[PDB]
């Protein structure tokens, strides 16, 4: 059956001799060449860069907490930047930051010297982490630390940055204490007056250009991730492929997930309108999320394959009709390909002179076996 079209016709008829006529053997079908995915532009970008580019970071005890959402978080720039020294992530893979997203993101910024960077970590205690900024053990997020000795240190000594060293109890995770009150380390009440038993809990760091490793200032930023039952408004960038037209492809225009060939269309949509439907409630045209154009979606070409042959007694030659298929896309093609309304004929030679119909093809065209 698979040897040649006449043998397929013989198998379909289950007869070794087939009479003159046109017989439908199989069904032509165009499989999708590729898959195209286009999601809208990343118009809203989460301003993590301006947090990283801030001239003066927040104090370690008074760490700035910002909730960011309704945007797109791009972590590719963070990976590309080589300034970061410690990029330890707890509870989440740094690679999957773009792939997976949360409902809300919280970011904290502070400046600390080199040797105290390691103290700011979940499940770790330190002289500064207990009384300035604490992270819970089960917390999921990333810690970003980079050297900023040139910016945050000078020859005279940069005392602008301040840290807390004394408190009655350690600060709770994600809780900031900004109290500047005098600490009552001794039994004698301070009453707001510095004394032998009273030392000011807040201190200003001393920075020099030649501090060395472990003592130079470091700008450390910690970001938080958590999930809520509310709909998520912030997520990472989505993959967008180049647009292809006049080719049978698989399109996913934000959930169409359909198969068809995309062509330019003259139909005009309302500004809020994206989809398009015909009478039968089938997708007909979809607007490209990137640009502003209407791409009519007619689906892949398909039809029945009909073998046009005379009687096997008369001769052994066939012509193939691919019904309702423009055979710019497809006996093998390239042999006397002639196009008509019902399809195009492979293996038949068109003649301008007209005779009476012998094998009805369709739309007035008839095949015949003639010299």
């Amino acid at each position, epitope marked *: 059956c698979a040897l040649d079209p006449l043998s397929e016709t013989k198998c379909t008829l289950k007869s070794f001799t087939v009479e003159k006529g046109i017989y439908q053997t199989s069904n032509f079908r165009v499989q999708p060449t590729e898959s195209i995915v286009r999601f809208p532009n990343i118009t809203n970008l989460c301003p993590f860069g301006e947090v990283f580019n801030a001239t003066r970071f927040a104090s370690v005890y008074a760490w700035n907490r910002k909730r960011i959402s309704n945007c797109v978080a791009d972590y590719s720039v963070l*990976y*590309n*930047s*080589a300034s*970061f*020294s*410690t*990029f*330890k*992530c*707890y*509870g*989440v*893979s*740094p*690679t*999957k930051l773009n792939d*997976l997203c949360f409902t809300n993101v919280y970011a904290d910024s502070f400046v600390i010297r080199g040797d105290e960077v*390691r*103290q700011i*970590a*979940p*499940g*770790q205690t330190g002289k500064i982490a207990d009384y300035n900024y604490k992270l819970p*053990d*089960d917390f*999921t997020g990333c810690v970003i630390a980079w050297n900023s000795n040139n910016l945050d240190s000078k020859v005279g000594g940069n005392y602008n940055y301040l840290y807390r060293l004394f408190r009655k109890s350690n600060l709770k995770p994600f809780e900031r204490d900004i109290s500047t009150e005098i600490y009552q380390a001794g039994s004698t009440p301070c009453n707001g007056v510095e004394g032998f038993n009273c030392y000011f809990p807040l201190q200003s760091y001393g920075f020099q250009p030649t501090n060395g*490793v472990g003592y130079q200032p470091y700008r450390v930023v910690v970001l938080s991730f958590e999930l809520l039952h509310a709909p998520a408004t912030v997520c990472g960038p989505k993959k967008s492929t180049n647009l292809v037209k006049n080719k049978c492809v698989n399109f996913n225009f934000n959930g169409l997930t359909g198969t068809g060939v995309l062509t330019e269309s003259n139909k005009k949509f309302l500004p809020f309108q994206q989809f398009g439907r015909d009478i039968a409630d089938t997708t007909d045209a979809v607007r490209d999320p990137q640009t502003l154009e209407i791409l009519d979606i007619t689906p892949c070409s398909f039809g029945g394959v009909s073998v046009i042959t005379p009687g096997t007694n008369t001769s052994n030659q066939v012509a193939v009709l691919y019904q309702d298929v423009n055979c710019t896309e497809v006996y093998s093609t390239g042999s006397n390909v002639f196009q008509t309304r019902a399809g195009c004929l492979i293996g038949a030679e068109h003649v301008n002179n007209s005779y009476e119909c012998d094998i009805p093809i369709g739309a007035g065209i008839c095949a015949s076996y003639q010299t």
Partner: antibody
Amino acid sequence: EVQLKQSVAELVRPGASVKVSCTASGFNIKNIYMHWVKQRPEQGLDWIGRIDPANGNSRYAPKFQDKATITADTSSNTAYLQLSSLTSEDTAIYYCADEGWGFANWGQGTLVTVSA
Amino acid sequence: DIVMTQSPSSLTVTAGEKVTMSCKSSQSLLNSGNQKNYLTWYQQKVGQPPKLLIYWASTRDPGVPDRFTGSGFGTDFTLTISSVQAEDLAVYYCQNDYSYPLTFGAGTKVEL
């Protein structure tokens, strides 16, 4: 903190299949594409392969290709490692990973041994 | 596939004395953008799985962080320790990460 509690070691027979499950606490597998690693005793440690929760498309080391197949469960906070054609060399300790810059969190250590 | 060898893989020191070990890495592990090498050190005792001693070839992991700083452009790496203690009596593994097929090193035994 974060810990990886993989399944306790169990006896296996040659020519059979063994599934090893690694559990995690403090997070979910959905953002973690955990690696799998085996430590051959009295020999340099070697890497088995990598998997992903969604679209796993697992890639293994060339020595373990078509031999160690590992699947990732979307839910239940677990991932399953499957082995076949276990021999005497296959008797080694296995660990989990957190695919950080290095393998951040390793399993407690399962000692798979095949014998009669 | 990168062949990773650690030297000398066995060496003895007195307590609180510097150690000189290095594992040579081929393929010149380097990444665009970030100049930090994608080779991570490890510290493995007898009984529990290895833990990150150094990642990015220069980053002190929290916990017993007595130096471990490594200087290397990719062709060579160093994990000298100034003073060795009970927690330092272990085997150190250096592993490549830039190449997707990664192979761990043989390891080096150090004892007080």
